[PDB]
Amino acid sequence: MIRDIIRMGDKRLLRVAPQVTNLGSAELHALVSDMFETMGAAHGVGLAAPQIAVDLQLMVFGFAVPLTALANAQIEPLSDEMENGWEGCLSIPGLRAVIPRYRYIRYRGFAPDGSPIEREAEGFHARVVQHEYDHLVGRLYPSRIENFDTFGFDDVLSY
Ligand SMILES: O=C(O)C[C@@H](Cc1ccccc1)C(=O)SCC(=O)c1ccccc1
Ligand code: NI
Ligand code: NI
Query: Domains (ranges, CATH) in the chain?
Result: 1-159 (3.90.45.10)
Query: d(Cα 119, Cα 143) in Å, to the nearest integer?
Result: 27
| Method used experimentally | X-ray
Per-residue exposure over 49-59, b if at least 16 CB sit within 10 Å of its own CB, e if not: bbbbeeebbbb
Provide residues with CB under 6 Å of ligand 1. 43-48, 51, 86-91, 127-128, 131-132, 135
Residue ranges for the binding site?
Answer: 89, 131, 135
How many Cα atoms within 13 Å fall on the side-chain side of residue 3? Answer: 22
Q: Which residues are catalytic?
A: 132
Largest Cα–Cα separation, the chain: 47
- Taking alpha carbons only, the member of 32, 34, 33 closest to residue 3 is 34
Please give the single-letter amino acid code of residue 129: V
Distance 81 CA to ligand 3 centre (A): 7
Please tell me what resolution, in angstroms, this structure has: 1.9
